[PDB]
Design a protein around this ligand. Structure first.
Ligand SMILES: CCCCCCCCCCCCCCCC(=O)OC[C@H](CO[C@@H]1O[C@H](CS(=O)(=O)O)[C@@H](O)[C@H](O)[C@H]1O)OC(=O)CCCCCCCCCCCCCCC
Ligand code: SF4
Ligand code: SF4
Ligand code: SF4
Lengths: 193, 55, 156, 393, 68, 110, 147, 206
């Protein structure tokens, strides 16, 4: 009637003390592990092989069929053709993409028939003036950044390009490969017995 | 190493190791290789030394 | 239909629109006897709605109020899951609220009123959830003229 | 300069600026001395008009848009958007694509539950687990970013006839690594937490719906399965490649915040079983092995067959969805998604409507705040997993 | 007459009397009266108009338009 | 409570600013053109804007005081401001502030 | 050396086109722009990755084509030269107009040489280009650093 | 009509200072201010999550001193993350004006710089926040990688380090305010309490 209440109170208080001591030990243990922080400005994280960055445009390959304008979610790419009258050839006068309105879904890059349009790994776009985000046909090629070729950045692979069993990519040797073998290697092994 | 050629990547310290692509543009000594694969054609810039003009 | 004949014996008639590429059969209940059909269905093990919202059947023709039903047995296989429809005329009219029979008609009917204008007779708290309450227009109708607001003009 | 106390029910505005992850919700709530008399939730601060857009975009033009209704997991709604015209056209999806779709949906469910779990534990405790989920939620971001282009939402990895592309090369092994590294921690959570008596009495009996009232109020999500209903759209609808995997649909019986937490944790634990069971059984295995077999003999062999392709026939952006409406569904993280497509004859649908699970689980916010306390408001808010992106339609 | 993307313009008054413009507001925006109204579809009697402002298209009827 | 239509370089309220406060009134409809000084103003242009505001609040108003109608007035005032800036009556500030051309870039009128 | 005089402005007036090497945290070069602005020079930064030929954008005119998104068929704007228009709008007692380029790494050696040459002609016009790099804010003439 | 949308062409050129002591003190005034930006905990939609990923352990903006603040009175930086509908535009301007004067804005994601994927066929989304508040930095992209938000922070720090204590005049608000009586029938507010105690919730009408 009154002793059961007190024994329940004790079994609750000692349990609450142990379940705070355990958490205290866990937190004091957590400060021995190496921080997973990817210290961005000097430890930029190298993107994947399918990362959809800034669009790249090869003015010479464009044939002005406007499929980029047609599969765009917002019909963004401005294509200005004139249709010269030599025999039938369309002529491109100005190709542009307002990257301020852009969605980076890369439908345009998926349906370019002439491989004229591609994705890059430039995620570092930022300006003081959004009117400077409208890229001319010339400001689009510009030979992308390539984080690896930067003298003040130690690139860090992400989880999908680390060898088997490896979880973090900070303390990594200089000879790691992605996870397994490529198809050509497996076929070459199967070729010999 | 000229544009239009099909090249492979020979640098064990790169995520695009042993990938094969086509040279889209070369300026200032560095190249730009387009890997047509997966779904979206990727384009990344390599040094003139981290390639090999595969036949 | 297996449900169209189920309420046939209950001495009330409804049309039959058939199946809809999913096995579900569609019946067109009239606007005035909606509550009776919904009641006789809720008595016949139809206790779960899953969808209520309207749709404009044409740019000037009339609106609709499509309901959806299902038996919802525990640890069940593919259940019957009938649906009904209610064709309300365009200009004036409106349909009754099934909130009292089964709920989930509190907000779904509220959103249908906010997007299409369909009033729901006997519905509690008929306001506009989306589309700020001082709005006017029923913006999801096939012919809605959006105001010439400055923050919708462009990013010039 | 003061507030002139007076004996009335006090109305407080937990307005749109929520300094949390619970979207933008206004929640004008009145209270009589640390109680709740009734609250009027004011939703709509994120209505961007997805339903009117969907009527003017073709399918492949609309598929990037869908990753926004219920941000998180931005592949459940992609799955339902792909399934909607796919069912009308009757386009057959191969089995390999179905397995990849299952794996992606399960990883998305895990990520959804992690995003719900972080701020939930924060609102009923400390802010450190918010720094632990985002250490564990990034290992799935970095798998998505390999498979599809981006991280979570804006993947647009799904396609009508299958999946945009095959996985990367060293992907199955690395997903196995993540599963083996993560499965112990769903239990490490219930070790470090879920046993503090102060923490379990906090959500012991606060928030409650009877089994017969959850059916009436249409609480499709785990909010249903926490009220004693063994019913999820993966086993009742026979979603594409299920019955091929073991099934323990988790259900509680009381119907409270604690029940919701337990069901969500057991479901996050079952998702790892589903993933590990599918990975060992892809129609073709890891992609490097499949590519090797195809370049060794698959010029004409069975490895180049329809059942082993990541996609069916690639469709033009002018797919022209057929005539006839129907209602499609997927058991998302927060419950049932529903798209009531109609379509008449052309690329643009007719009344593409979205039925979001959170929009219906949120209907009983007032009923669940029928005089509980003023402090357990945020716990009941977090027990529902509100995402305002799915409260725009 | 009205067909294939001809630039149309609602006249002034055949619109706000036909009991099919009770959807929108009583006031009307000034972009209805400019000769920029490219038609995108014709469902026999009604026509979908684009109205070059970034707001959804409008389903009016050929009675409420002129070729401008 | 206040009822307002606040956008960039237009701020319509429903009260009277006595010394810096607002004090909702239900008939004052104050106006605060360009607080952040995105543009540079003149004495004639501000008078034109005030006249437009008056003829917009007075000549066309018998309707409710919902925030919808306040936004509807503010939108017309801002279209008028943009027209003034297009014709050249006013211009951007060019000062050392943020300088993002919110109403459009300078063009050459070809 | 933790506090700088005015050698930066003298070096800019001498060379004409500098090439900063700011640290990749971006809070330690703004003071040099403030030093420039306090002398009389007016700055305008425009984030180099996003300009066109650099001759049509800076010297000549160029037709900017805004983002039509299904509506508002293609229209051009012809914004005036980004330099000749800002040399006219200088304050009354203005010593010149220096052009700041934030992400100079994206440009090419040809464009760098062009920007260097453009400083000699067009008198009241200097150039600073934040080519990324060193862990201290060091500069170097832009005629150098190339070839 | 010579040049549309012209520029100011001002007078009274700069009245700036030059002595080494005051510019050296300005150095500290601008260093203390840019290396301790406190963002407002303000998210609306998808992008907020990436902002939260920028808070997490994988890479935290705790270094270079960013501590997220809840009330706008202590915040000096608002990273607008998410689409701003017309229902919530005045709820942002408020939070921006209700916040001390040396303050900054970053428009992240495409939905706050141009309107984004909703710049077409949307009747409620504000087409860019640059038409509500004076944005300082724009970073494009549906959800931008959280090491692009940090790139925006870099580009904002190097803009803050530019300010001049002898130039804080371009920081107040001019307040060119007017007044005009109206006749517009004030209506009662339709947004109060009374959700479950409403009489229409307790019994169906006859
Ligand atoms: C009860 C009593 C209590 C009273 C309270 C006490 C109040 C104390 C107030 C004073 C606190 C000021 C601390 C300043 C610390 C600091 O600056 O950060 C160090 C940083 C670190 O970057 C540095 O910069 C260098 C790189 S670089 O060249 O700048 O790029 C390099 O050195 C490296 O980055 C780093 O070292 O230095 C800077 O970045 C540049 C800022 C320049 C600072 C100005 C120098 C200080 C002068 C003082 C004014 C004297 C006036 C006379 C001079 C002629
Ligand atoms: S890049 Fe491709 S889609 Fe774009 S205009 Fe050229 S051919 Fe057409
Ligand atoms: S990235 Fe998206 S919005 Fe941009 S051009 Fe490609 S498809 Fe269009
Ligand atoms: S900016 Fe992009 S990611 Fe962010 S809310 Fe808008 S659409 Fe979503």
């Amino acid at each position: 009637k009154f002793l059961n209440q007190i024994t329940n109170y004790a079994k609750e208080a000692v349990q609450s003390a142990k379940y705070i001591g355990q958490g205290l030990s866990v937190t004091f243990d957590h400060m021995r592990r190496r921080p997973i922080t990817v210290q961005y400005p000097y430890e930029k994280l190298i993107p994947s092989e399918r990362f959809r960055g800034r669009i790249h445009f090869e003015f010479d390959k464009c044939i002005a069929c406007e499929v980029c304008v047609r599969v765009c979610p917002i019909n963004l790419p401005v294509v200005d053709w004139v249709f010269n009258k030599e025999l039938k050839k369309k002529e491109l006068k100005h190709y542009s993409i307002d990257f301020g309105v852009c969605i980076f879904c890369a439908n345009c890059v998926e349906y370019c028939p002439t491989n004229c349009l591609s994705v890059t790994e430039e995620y570092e776009l930022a300006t003081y003036d959004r009117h400077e985000l409208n890229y001319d046909s010339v400001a689009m090629g510009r030979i992308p950044y390539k984080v690896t070729q930067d003298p003040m950045v130690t690139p860090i692979r992400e989880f999908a390009y680390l060898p088997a069993g490896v979880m973090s990519g900070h303390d990594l040797p200089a000879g790691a490969q992605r996870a397994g073998e490529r198809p050509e290697a497996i076929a070459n092994t199967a070729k010999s017995s | 190493i000229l544009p239009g050629m099909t090249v492979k990547v020979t640098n064990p310290n790169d995520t695009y190791y042993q990938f094969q692509g086509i040279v889209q543009r070369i300026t200032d000594g560095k190249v730009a290789v387009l890997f047509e694969g997966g779904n979206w054609d990727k384009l990344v810039t390599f040094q003139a030394s981290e390639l090999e003009p595969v036949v | 239909g297996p449900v169209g004949r189920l309420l046939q014996s209950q001495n009330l008639s409804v049309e039959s629109l058939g199946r809809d590429a999913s096995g579900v059969e569609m019946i067109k209940v009239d606007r005035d006897r909606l509550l009776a059909v919904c009641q006789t269905l809720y008595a016949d093990g139809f206790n779960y709605l899953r969808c209520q919202a309207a749709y404009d059947s044409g740019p000037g023709q009339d609106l609709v109020s499509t309901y959806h039903l299902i038996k919802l047995s525990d640890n069940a296989d593919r259940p019957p899951e009938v649906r009904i429809k209610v064709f309300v005329p365009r200009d004036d009219p409106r349909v009754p609220s099934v909130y009292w029979i089964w709920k989930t008609a509190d907000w779904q009917e509220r959103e249908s009123y906010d997007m299409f204008g369909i009033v729901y007779e006997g519905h509690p708290n008929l306001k506009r959830i989306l589309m700020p309450e001082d709005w006017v227009g029923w913006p999801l109708r096939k012919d809605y003229i959006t105001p010439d607001f400055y923050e919708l003009q462009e990013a010039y | 300069p003061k507030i002139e106390t007076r004996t009335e029910p006090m109305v407080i505005n937990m307005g749109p600026h929520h300094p949390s992850m619970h979207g933008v919700l206004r929640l004008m709530v009145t209270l009589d001395g640390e109680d709740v008399i009734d609250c009027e939730p004011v939703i709509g601060y994120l209505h961007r008009g997805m339903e009117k857009i969907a009527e003017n975009r073709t399918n492949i033009m609309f598929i990037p848009y869908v990753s926004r209704w219920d941000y998180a997991a931005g592949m459940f709604n992609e799955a339902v958007t792909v399934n909607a015209p796919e069912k009308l056209a009757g386009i057959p999806v191969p089995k390999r694509a179905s397995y990849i779709r299952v794996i992606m949906l399960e990883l998305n469910r895990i990520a959804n539950h992690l995003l719900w779990l972080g701020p939930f534990l924060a609102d009923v405790g400390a802010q450190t687990p918010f720094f632990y989920i985002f250490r564990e939620r990034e290992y799935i971001y970095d798998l998505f970013e390999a498979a599809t282009g981006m991280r979570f939402i804006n993947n647009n990895y799904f396609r009508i006839g299958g999946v945009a592309a095959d996985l990367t090369y060293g992907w199955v092994t690395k997903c196995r690594d993540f599963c083996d590294y993560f499965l112990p921690k769903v239990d490490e959570y219930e070790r470090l937490i879920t046993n503090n008596p102060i923490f379990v009495r906090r959500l012991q009996g606060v928030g409650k719906i009877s089994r017969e009232e959850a059916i009436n109020w249409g609480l499709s999500g785990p909010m249903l399965r926490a009220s004693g209903v063994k019913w999820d759209l993966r086993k009742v609808d026979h979603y594409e490649c299920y019955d091929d995997f073991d099934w323990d649909v988790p259900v509680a019986t009381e119907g409270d915040c604690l029940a919701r937490y337990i069901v969500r944790i057991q479901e996050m634990r079952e998702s790892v079983k589903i993933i590990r069971q599918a990975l060992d059984g892809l129609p073709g295995g890891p992609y490097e092995n499949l590519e090797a077999k195809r370049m060794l003999e698959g010029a004409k062999s069975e490895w180049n067959g329809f059942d082993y392709q990541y996609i069916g026939k690639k469709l033009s952006p002018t797919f022209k969805i057929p005539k006839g409406e129907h209602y499609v569904r997927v058991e998302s993280g927060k419950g049932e998604l529903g798209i009531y497509l109609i379509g008449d004859d052309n690329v643009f649908p007719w009344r593409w409507k979205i039925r979001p699970p959170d929009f219906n689980n949120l209907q009983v916010l007032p009923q669940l705040l029928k005089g509980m306390k003023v402090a357990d408001i945020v716990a009941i808010l977090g027990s529902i997993d509100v995402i305002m992106g799915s409260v725009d339609r | 007459a009205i067909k294939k993307g001809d630039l149309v313009k609602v006249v002034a008054e055949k619109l706000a009397n036909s009991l099919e413009a009770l959807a929108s507001d009583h006031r009307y925006p000034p972009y209805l009266f400019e000769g920029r109204g490219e038609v995108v579809d014709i469902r026999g009697d009604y026509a979908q108009i684009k109205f070059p402002v970034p707001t959804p298209t409008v389903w009016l009827r050929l009675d409420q338009l002129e070729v401008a | 409570m206040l009822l307002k239509s606040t956008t960039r370089h237009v701020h319509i309220y429903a009260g009277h600013v006595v010394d810096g406060e607002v004090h909702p009134d239900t008939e004052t409809l104050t106006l605060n053109v360009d607080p952040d000084n995105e543009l540079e103003w003149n004495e004639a242009a501000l008078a034109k804007v005030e006249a437009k505001f008056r003829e917009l609040v007075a000549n066309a108003a018998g309707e409710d005081l919902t925030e919808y109608n306040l936004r509807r007035i503010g939108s017309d005032l801002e279209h008028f401001i943009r027209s003034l800036l297009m014709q050249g009556e006013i211009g951007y500030n060019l000062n050392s502030r943020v300088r993002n051309y919110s109403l459009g870039i300078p063009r050459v009128n070809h | 050396g933790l506090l700088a005089g005015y050698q930066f402005v003298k070096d800019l007036e001498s060379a004409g086109a500098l090439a900063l090497f700011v640290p990749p945290e971006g809070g330690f070069e703004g003071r040099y722009q403030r030093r420039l602005r306090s002398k009389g020079y007016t700055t305008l930064p425009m984030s180099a990755p996003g300009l066109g030929d650099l001759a049509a954008y800076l010297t000549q005119e160029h037709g900017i084509r805004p983002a039509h998104t299904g509506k508002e068929d293609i229209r051009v704007y012809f914004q005036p030269p980004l330099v000749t228009y800002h040399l006219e709008n200088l304050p009354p007692n203005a010593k010149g107009l220096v052009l700041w380029l934030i992400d100079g790494k994206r440009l090419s050696k040809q464009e760098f040489a062009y920007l260097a040459q453009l400083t000699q002609t067009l008198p009241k016009f200097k150039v600073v280009v934040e080519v990324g790099g060193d862990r201290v804010v060091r500069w170097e003439p832009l005629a150098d650093w190339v070839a | 009509p010579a040049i549309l949308n012209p520029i100011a062409r001002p007078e009274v050129p700069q009245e700036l200072a030059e002595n080494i002591i005051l510019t050296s003190l300005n150095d500290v005034y601008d260093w203390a201010r840019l290396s301790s930006l406190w963002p407002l905990m303000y998210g609306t939609a998808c992008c907020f999550i990436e902002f939260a990923a920028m808070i997490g352990s994988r890479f935290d903006f705790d270094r270079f001193g960013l501590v997220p603040r809840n009330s706008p009175r202590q915040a000096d930086l608002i990273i607008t993350s998410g689409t701003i509908t017309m229902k919530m535009a005045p709820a942002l301007v408020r939070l921006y004006e209700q916040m001390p004067s040396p303050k900054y804005v970053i428009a992240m994601g495409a939905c706050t710089i141009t309107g984004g994927m909703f710049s077409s066929d949307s009747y409620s989304a504000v087409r860019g926040v640059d038409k509500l508040i004076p944005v300082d930095v724009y970073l494009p992209g549906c959800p931008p990688r959280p090491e692009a938000i940090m790139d925006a922070i870099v580009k904002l720090r190097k803009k803050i380090a530019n300010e001049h204590i002898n130039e804080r005049g371009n920081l107040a608000q001019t307040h060119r305010l007017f007044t005009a009586k109206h006749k517009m029938k004030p209506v009662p507010p339709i947004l109060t309490g009374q959700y479950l105690n409403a009489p229409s919730r307790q019994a169906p009408p006859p």
